[PDB]
């Protein structure tokens, strides 16, 4: 996401930067989703929905 | 059918032979019929000597 | 600019509070002030309120 | 664009669309309050850039 | 060092009205329990009095029935003082059925063991047209005092049912009230008092019933009176929720179909503190689950964030 940074990067781009590359980002991003998904950490993002 | 009767009551004395009690709270129009009547109670009809 | 108007119309039914201005016919203006309970209105001797 | 008079309103839960019909406008004798929605309603905004 | 008083005679005049008489007085009390009797009678005295009703083929209170010379907001204010009187039961549904040019009185309605129609003359409404035709649920209930219909809405959660027009509760039946306390000489008494409690109900409390409750509550009132002991409460409630107040909602707001709503019900899921822990494993064998069954449930638990089946080694705390 464009988070605190000028543009967002595409998928690829993003595995580059790291060296280990491809589907293993697709899943680090999935799973870090999937941790500010349920509570304790859940509660404070969801009050900002309407 | 059934009734409010009071919470929270702080008799709160200035000097030993004079006092102050507040008392919450009271269904509408229940202070001043209790008031009253324990005013004429307590002025009137006390026994004593003098 | 305008394709179709939707008007609703409703029934409020409004009871009386402080706030009001009521009057008799002689100029005598007066902003009601307080609700009383019936209990707290001065009657007569035939224990009929005012 | 056009705006619609759609019943099928964005972020808004079945709470809301129990006292309209199917149209979008609420029906007739229903006795609403503050915040209730008489008539459903969109405007054509597109491509927000969030 | 102190007397006590009783009640004499009372005296009935009408069905509405009534003197009850309280003879052994002392110097002042007469105005003592006088005063503060008046003041619990009109006020804090039990009474059942019309609440809700439905009528035929009427929306909303500011509309017409055909073939009634009265309005149905016209209709609704003569019940307001319908005057009944149950027993054994706290909210009874009466049922009025009636046809052809006729007045509908009070009378014209169904009786129940427990309902008396303290005055079965009083009007209800006219018919008009031969074949002009009435017929209503007139819902009582009995509580304290004047709820009006207003504040009768704040509990709503499906009120729905547009034919129920409110009426304002006017629960009670003290109309008014007046002591005299004339001076009353027990044959030896230096002076002792009389008290003659006139008073006027709608028909609906004998007496004795009422200056009976009203002295009742003068007494558990005057009981906290007595001793004193400062009391307090508590407080400092939790500020540390674990979970997202999310899990504390029921099943109802995830706005789902009714095959799928009764059936949460049915294997003891209410609040979606127990939906979020049940696997996919756990609803084939749950009663009448399947493809477009169980669809259903991971897209509304998709919507609003959460998901099927997961844990929380600590639910649900803790009050």
């Not at chain 5, 074949?131 to 704040?154: D, F, L, W």
């Not at chain 5, 127990?274 to 996919?280: C, P």
Request: hydrophobic share 35%; net charge negative.
């Amino acid at each position: 996401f464009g988070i605190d940074m000028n543009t967002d990067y595409t998928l690829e781009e993003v595995g580059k930067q790291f060296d280990v590359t491809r589907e293993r980002i697709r899943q680090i991003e999935a799973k870090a989703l999937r941790k500010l998904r349920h509570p304790s950490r859940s509660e404070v993002l969801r009050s900002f929905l309407d | 059918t059934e009734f409010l009767k009071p919470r929270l009551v702080d008799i709160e004395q200035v000097s030993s032979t004079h006092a102050k009690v507040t008392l919450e709270p009271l269904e509408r129009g229940f202070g001043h019929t209790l008031g009253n009547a324990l005013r004429r109670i307590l002025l009137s009809s006390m026994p004593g000597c003098a | 600019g305008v394709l179709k108007i939707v008007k609703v119309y409703l029934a409020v039914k409004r009871r009386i509070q402080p706030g009001d201005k009521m009057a008799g016919r002689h100029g005598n203006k007066g902003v009601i002030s307080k609700i009383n309970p019936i209990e707290d209105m001065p009657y007569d001797e035939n224990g009929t309120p005012v | 664009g056009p705006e619609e008079i759609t019943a099928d309103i964005p972020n808004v839960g079945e709470a809301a669309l129990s006292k309209l019909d199917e149209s979008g406008i609420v029906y007739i004798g229903a006795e609403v309050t503050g915040g209730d929605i008489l008539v459903g309603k969109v405007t054509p905004k597109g491509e927000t850039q969030l | 060092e102190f007397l006590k008083p009783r009640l004499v005679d009372i005296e009935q005049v009408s069905s509405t009205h009534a003197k009850v008489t309280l003879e052994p007085l002392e110097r002042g009390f007469g105005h003592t329990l006088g005063n503060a009797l008046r003041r619990i009678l009109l006020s804090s005295m039990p009474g059942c009095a019309v609440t809700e009703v439905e009528i035929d083929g009427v929306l909303h209170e500011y509309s017409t029935k055909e073939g009634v010379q009265e309005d149905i907001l016209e209709i609704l204010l003569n019940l307001k003082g319908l005057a009944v009187r149950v027993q054994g039961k706290d909210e009874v549904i009466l049922t009025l059925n009636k046809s052809g040019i006729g007045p509908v009185t009070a009378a014209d309605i169904t009786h129940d063991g427990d309902v008396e129609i303290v005055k079965p003359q009083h009007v209800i409404c006219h018919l008009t047209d031969e074949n002009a035709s009435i017929s209503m649920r007139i819902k009582v209930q009995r509580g304290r005092g004047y709820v009006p219909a207003s504040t009768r809405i704040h509990s709503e959660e499906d009120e729905r049912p547009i034919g129920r027009l409110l009426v304002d509760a006017c629960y009670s039946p003290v109309e008014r009230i007046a002591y005299n306390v004339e001076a009353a000489r027990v044959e030896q008494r230096t002076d002792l008092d009389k008290l003659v409690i006139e008073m006027e109900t709608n028909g609906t409390i004998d007496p004795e019933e009422a200056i009976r409750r009203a002295a009742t509550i003068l007494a558990e009132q005057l009981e906290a009176f007595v001793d004193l002991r400062d009391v307090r409460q508590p407080e400092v409630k939790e500020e540390k929720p674990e979970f997202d107040p999310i899990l504390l909602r029921p099943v109802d707001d995830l706005e789902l179909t009714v095959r799928s709503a009764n059936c949460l019900k049915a294997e003891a899921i209410h609040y979606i503190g127990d939906l979020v822990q049940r696997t996919e494993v756990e609803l084939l064998k749950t009663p009448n689950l399947g493809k477009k069954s169980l669809t259903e449930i991971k897209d509304v638990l998709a919507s609003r964030g959460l998901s099927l089946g997961m844990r929380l080694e600590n639910w649900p705390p803790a009050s």
